[PDB]
RNA sequence: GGAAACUGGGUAUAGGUUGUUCCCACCUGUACCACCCACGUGGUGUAGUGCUCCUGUAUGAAACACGUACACUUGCACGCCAGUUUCC
RNA sequence: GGAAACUGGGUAUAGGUUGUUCCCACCUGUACCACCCACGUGGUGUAGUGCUCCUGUAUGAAACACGUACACUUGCACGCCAGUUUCC
């Protein structure tokens, strides 16, 4: 039976100078063959801790790790701006090696309402026979938003997708794009295309919309 | 000084096979264990395989049993991963990692390659079509406007978007791509700009999809309807 | 001012396979600059742990150290007989360096009776005008024994001294010598010199004796 | 290969001075911190002083400041402890210890010398007399008999007892010295042997008391008639 | 006191018994009772030596394997002790 | 299209100017409220550059000192965005 490393929390929000601790539990004993890694988006992992509590050379002393039974904790005693990243534990006590699911560390900040933009399908794409409606939520916080499309007041299911940016390095906000895709034939059957945004920065849901052909 | 470079990545048909290679510099692989670790888009690290020094022993994640084969050619300082019977599930970035020296870093993986993307899909290489997200004739939101480019129906990843050949960066968001039911990716890139610049400034997005050598520049304007 | 390292217990006994833990609490923070050392009696200390939780090369993995705030524990997961020693913590976070008082660890084992020998004064020593009568208790356990000197059945007081070997790190037995000192004049006033030993390995006390001048 | 050897210890009058030396081999002292640590008989370790590499900075325990002076002769690979105004309290075994490499063992002291005993006392050196502890007059046990050497009335410590010039080691107990009310130490060394080995084995204890250059060999036998 | 040959944990007991006077030894059975294993229908003087076997620990650029060192445990041989018998 | 000069956190509110339209490009006082400091009776468009200043971090056989690399925080100048004003 493979050793499972259960890592918690899966994400946490903190501000610079804070002390974070990430825990990681071995399903069965691993003694001390635990490593921790820091990964930033688009980059390879970097080793931080080995043998559960030993600071890898070149790594700042604000990182440390400790072991208590089958519990392993990574601690950052005082968060620096370069420490927002994802962190993984790893057992190497026996093969197969096992990684934790990861913990994402994010910048806390004041709530910021999304700004909603709606964008109708372009003339060029309608030539292709397909119609895409894009809704933008810009520079908001926290990350949680819910966007549902209504087309002539019918809530849409299963024909739009979202995508969210990484947290902005300067102002710590997220942005989110939602795209609703219809065949141009099916598009021409309705008139009012709306994006309804609920976010905790919004004291009541925002609706942005347009009418097909009337701009 | 010390580094590892994976290559051999790319697009593979389902049920296909691929041999990744991991070329070492700054040290000799015969004295280290070498590991392959992969990462599906938006997911954690998954250990794949490893090879022992002095004994040649090999270990495999159960999820690649009978399909992957790790190996090492010490007269090239290069490690290899032979992948067979590839399925879409094996789409990930693949890293090779060196287990560091026991006395100095235990069993930690102390150096990692930048990793090579492997894409398992029966879809065919295709450059994107790019469409403008025109700033609203009336009112996208208000204040300062937003505009963008929809980079739709391309394959495989990745795609490069820049604005005005890199000279406008502030307020730009290029979103993570989303894989559609058609098997083609689609992403959008957006920019927010002064509302007063709209009458005096043209905004053109530069899309580059290297797997098909497609460069598309798209000028985005307010619509005139 | 000076950082104080407080170590507990100051002594302990346990048997092979037991898990021993020695704690050591630093008054004010030392971060992680703690080392543990094993000193066997009569020998230089040997380093065991550094940076509070890193295993020094060559040291068995049944040794480990952990840190929690200003508390440091050395753990031996499975006691071997050769782990009889005194163990010291040490802070090296700021000068002056500080050691804890040490924890002396000895091995529990099955009761073992002493074998008693008695030794009369040599002719050479009696030349000088002094008599030393030696009682030997060999290879016993536990450490507590009671040795009474009788000179013609007069229980002797205040003219003998004891010495006990370090616990045998191999079989964990002790040996003990008792030395009775009389002037040659006082020695020659009596005939029967006896050593009486009570120890719990003995179902009743053993006496060894001799007669002065009787060969 | 790496080792440290202290010398210069011995017996000193109160208010006297003494220079300890610590001669290194297998490594160069200028790339390490060097520490002096002492241990009063029957007590713990007490840190005394240290000297830093590349700068010569020195640090002193509170109780020896202004009287002890640590220094290092990097051209002889030796460290020194100048002890002046010696007080009664300064009786201890004195170790020099190397602080290990930062990257390899933190601040731990990874090699230690065997130590040199320093004895502060206005008392006078005296060699032991060695007396036979003769095997059993009545042949006590038909199994193994005991014999030994009584090493009496010496000062200061220490004294070494060996058997048959080291050729007999099994079953030897050399007891800790005991301070008699006279101010002289006394110990015995004992050994068990087959009762039949008497008359067929010569047993000689070799007593060496270096503080007075006394070497005594004593052959031990059952008494006669 | 020499030289050889034989035997090897107690304890208790039925005993037996240098074939001779109870029985020292010898010699077992039995019940026991311990110590030690790799735990059986098991083994049984032992801090010596060689080899063997069982593992553990540490280390060699070293998770397994392989080396080295150190410990651990089987057994055998030789030594040593304890008897015993025998002759000088 | 040149050339120049000047200005710079919101938010309220009292003024000044601006055409006159009641608000403007603005700008000053004040309150409130932020971000930032090295924390004041202080500072305020800015993911760029240089110098500087404040610390921190990593590392050099390295607890201090010394070297190097990297970050940080002042302040300044240039560049950049946003405006005005002016002149050809």
Residue numbers in the entry:
A (entry chain L), C (entry chain B): 1 to 215
B (entry chain H), D (entry chain A): 4 to 228
What wording appears in the published article?
Enteroviruses contain conserved RNA structures at the extreme 5′ end of their genomes that recruit essential proteins 3CD and PCBP2 to promote genome replication. Here, we determined the crystal structures of the coxsackievirus B3 and rhinoviruses B14 and C15 REPLRs at 1.54, 2.2 and 2.54 Å resolution, revealing a highly conserved H-type four-way junction fold with co-axially stacked sA-sD and sB-sC helices that are stabilized by a long-range A•C•U base-triple.
Consistent with the CVB3–DLmut and CVB3–BLmut, the two RVC15 REPLR structures, RVC15–DLmut and RVC15–BLmut, were very similar (RMSD = 0.972 Å for the superposition of the common cores without sB and sD loops). Notably, such an arrangement forms 2 bp between the 4WJ and the bulge in all these structures, suggesting that a single-nucleotide sD bulge is sufficient for the 3C binding, which is consistent with our 3C binding studies with the CVB3 REPLR. For example, RVB14 is expected to form an sD triloop (UAU), and RVC15 and PV1 show sC pentaloops (CACGU) compared to a typical sD tetraloop (UNCG type, N = A, U, G or C) and sC triloop (NCA, N = A, U, G or C) found in other enteroviral REPLRs. While the length of the sB helix is longer for CVB3 (9 base pairs) and RVC15 (8 bp) compared to that for RVB14 (7 base pairs), which may have implications in PCBP2 binding (discussed later), the sB loops seem more dynamic with the highest crystallographic B-factors.
